[PDB]
Each structure stands twice: as C-alpha cells, then as structure tokens.
Design a protein around this ligand. Structure first.
Ligand SMILES: O=C(O)c1cnccn1
Ligand SMILES: O=C(O)c1cnccn1
Length: 161
C-alpha cells in the first residue's frame, strides 16, 4: 500500500501543530482539500476555514489559493490528514516561533532550545568539519522563516475584517 506508506512518512516528518504551506485543490460541501508542500492532500474541514461560521467554502478560499495551514490530526487508518486555517491564524504571532514552522525538534520537552550537533554554544560558532550539518540546519531554518513570512502575508491580507 503506497498511500499508507506516503501518509505515514508524512506523519513521521511533521509534528501535530506544525503549520505548513498548501495549495487549495478542491472545494466540497464539507470543506476544502489542500495539497501540502507539493506532496499530498489534507482536508480543511468547513468549520476550520475561519473563525466566523461559513455556509460554503468559497466564502473563504478558492481553488488555486496558497495558504498556510495547521496540521491538526493524522488518521492513518482512514488515511485523512486534517488541516485548519482558522487555528493556524489563532496561533500566529508576529514574533517568530520556529517550533511551529518545521523546527520543533530543536526544542525539548520543557521547550528549551537544543543547540544542534556541530554548533558551539560557548563559542557561538559552527565547528569546522561540520559543514554538512551547518548547511542542512541553515536550510531548515531558512524554510521555517519563509513559512512564517508567508503566514504574516496571510494575516496582513486579513484587511478583509
Ligand atoms: O465524503 C467524505 O469523505 C467526507 C464527508 N464529510 C466529512 C468528511 N469526509
Ligand atoms: O477521498 C479523499 O479523502 C480525497 C478526495 N479528494 C482529494 C484527496 N482526498
């Protein structure tokens, strides 16, 4: 079963709560399907489109719209990924929280930051011979930033209210 395997891979590479970019692919009476990271599709249920009540999804999104959504549930049995636009926006903060955009593994159970393998907290510099790890990290971070920036844009485009 390839689909299960893909969705499982997805679940194991994304934390619940993660906020991710998506493209709206399809509208239905009960919500809007969104393709996540040019990957696979989740559902934004109609009640999770916005804070206000909504009679049809078109009231909030349209096919082809880009958006940042929160992953709120992953059901590998029913092979549904649940998404929320509403909650993504509820959790937005002008201040950047990398945990919510792809770097949750840089935080422990308390929420304390974990200095990555190869970075010297004392020296505050990357250790020579770790260029691979520096690269991967810098990349992950950049993406997390991009994502937050986009979300900011989405919130700014809330000049609707
Ligand atoms: O048609 C479906 O699969 C469906 C309908 N309502 C809620 C969730 N899923
Ligand atoms: O049956 C589903 O859950 C479905 C439908 N359209 C797109 C993605 N998923």
């Amino acid at each position: 079963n390839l689909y299960f395997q893909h969705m499982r891979h997805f679940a194991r590479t994304h934390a619940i709560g993660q906020i991710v970019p998506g493209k709206v692919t399809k509208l239905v009476p009960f919500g809007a399907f969104v393709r996540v990271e040019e990957g696979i599709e989740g559902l934004v249920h109609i009640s999770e489109l916005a804070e206000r009540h909504v009679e049809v999804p078109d009231q909030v999104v349209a096919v082809g719209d880009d958006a940042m959504v929160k992953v709120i549930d992953i059901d590998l049995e029913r092979r549904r990924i649940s998404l929320s636009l509403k909650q993504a926006n509820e959790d937005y903060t002008e201040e950047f929280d990398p945990a919510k955009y792809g770097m949750a593994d840089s935080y422990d159970e308390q929420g304390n930051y974990i200095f990555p393998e190869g970075f010297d907290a004392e020296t505050n510099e990357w250790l020579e011979g770790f260029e691979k790890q520096r690269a991967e990290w810098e990349a992950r971070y950049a993406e997390a930033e991009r994502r937050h920036k986009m979300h900011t844009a989405q919130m700014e485009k809330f000049a609707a209210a």
